[PDB]
Swiss-Prot record, chain B:
GO biological-process terms attached to the record: negative regulation of DNA-templated transcription; response to redox state
Alphabetical keyword list: Cytoplasm, DNA-binding, NAD, Repressor, Transcription, Transcription regulation
Name this protein carries in UniProt: Redox-sensing transcriptional repressor Rex
Subunit structure: Homodimer.
Described function: Modulates transcription in response to changes in cellular NADH/NAD(+) redox state.
Transmembrane stretches, start-end: none
Positions of NAD(+) binding: 78-83
Stored Pfam families: CoA_binding, Put_DNA-bind_N
PANTHER family for the chain: REDOX-SENSING TRANSCRIPTIONAL REPRESSOR REX, REDOX-SENSING TRANSCRIPTIONAL REPRESSOR REX 1
Family: Belongs to the transcriptional regulatory Rex family.
GO MF term list: DNA binding; DNA-binding transcription factor activity; identical protein binding
């Protein structure tokens, strides 16, 4: 039983590994990765423990191998197809975020208002949500839900139908879906506490 | 331990919920259990500060440590798609209250926003001190650094950065980067592991 916090740290090592591969760094360690994730080296070695023997020998790790290894663990070895249903303000912005990644790709921006439905979008065009059933299966697994709160639970159930794999949900309402699909809720303001604490702790900061 | 703060935050969440449910008292064994961490640890974290326990007292204690006691002034610099949407987001409330919305777009200055109103950016130094400490930087990559430059001069205490760029700001100013990205992978991993889920 791997802790939820463990997968989040794993997610952090990977991000720290591409940053490393961006500086021509080839091999690293649990001591370096930890100092960068702000955790104890033991924690890095530990989190990796939940998934098999890693960098056993003193040696350490080599950015390339671990980076690959972590991508496999977090399931980032495939290329998930993404869609943003609820093409409003957040939607239009999200739809244009620069660094989505090599394993995540947008392939559909949906929406119900006719005013938009049909306008070009950096890579494709908006389109109604009545085609969700034969636009999702082969190419879309993950749906970014930036639809108004009230509409959320209704646009949500629509996806579960066109067979959506997972839902990254930005609306302030707890979706109701079958175990067949995963829901991850976003909270852009989550970091305000980290910030709050940092302001009161210069010395620490 | 830079990692303790993240746990401490987890504890408070586990507490605020224990309270809402009516539970009166908890212990190191339970907090840990619910926070997926050893009692030894939880008991050790609360050690760096003030030290079973009573959900109400520890909650208040944790909140005081985390800063959530006072009521901070917030603001969004850059009322574009992200920033505009953010304004109408009903998730602040508590100890972070929105008290300003700025932008450079002259055709945006004046827009009636939630009772307030989109100011410009030049008043920051007079509008900031005493009223606002935290700014949600939601401007194009290209701007950001120059934006923060003002904000600092305006006397900003901390920035919650959405701009995908690592800002360069003096030490008196705390910065925190915000990303949805991580939740995507948590999603990714969560899909291939219905068991874990
Ligand atoms: N989690 C956060 O930190 C955060 C911050 C930003 C905004 N909000 C969320 O943003 C979402 C949208 O916000 P916005 O501020 O840009 O709103 P918006 O009103 O500009 O856009 C909403 C869009 O939803 C579309 N829509 C409504 N029902 C739909 C349906 N059934 N299917 C497809 N499209 C539908 C509309 O046509 C519109 O384009 C809300 O869920 C809100 O809670 C959350
Ligand atoms: N972290 C995330 O999850 C996330 C997702 C949304 C978008 N992005 C980032 O959010 C930011 C805004 O995205 P958007 O889609 O709303 O774009 P946008 O073009 O609508 O908004 C940027 C806004 O900044 C304003 N601006 C420019 N220079 C300024 C300055 N010097 N001072 C004050 N305001 C200024 C503009 O007038 C505009 O309204 C970008 O940096 C983008 O890359 C991040
Ligand atoms: Ca595919
Ligand atoms: Ca004040």
């Amino acid at each position: 039983k791997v802790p939820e916090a463990a997968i989040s740290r794993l997610i952090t090592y990977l991000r720290i590994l591409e940053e490393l591969e961006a500086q021509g760094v080839h091999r690293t360690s649990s001591e370096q990765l930890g100092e960068l994730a702000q955790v104890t080296a033991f924690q890095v070695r530990k989190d990796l423990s939940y998934f098999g023997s890693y960098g056993t020998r003193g040696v350490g790790y080599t950015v390339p191998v671990l980076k690959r290894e972590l991508r496999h663990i977090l399931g980032l070895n495939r290329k998930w197809g993404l869609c943003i249903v609820g093409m409003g303000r957040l939607g239009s912005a999200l739809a244009d975020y620069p660094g989505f990644g090599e394993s995540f790709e947008l392939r559909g921006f949906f929406d119900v208002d006719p005013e938009k439905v049909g306008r070009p979008v950096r890579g494709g065009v908006i389109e109604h949500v009545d085609l969700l059933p034969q636009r999702v299966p082969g190419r879309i697994e993950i749906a970014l839900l930036t639809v108004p709160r009230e509409a959320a639970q209704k646009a949500a159930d629509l996806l579960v139908a066109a067979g959506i794999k997972g839902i990254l949900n930005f609306a302030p309402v707890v979706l109701e879906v079958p175990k067949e699909v995963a829901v991850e809720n976003v909270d852009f303001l989550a970091g305000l506490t980290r910030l709050s604490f940092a302001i009161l702790n210069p010395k620490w900061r």
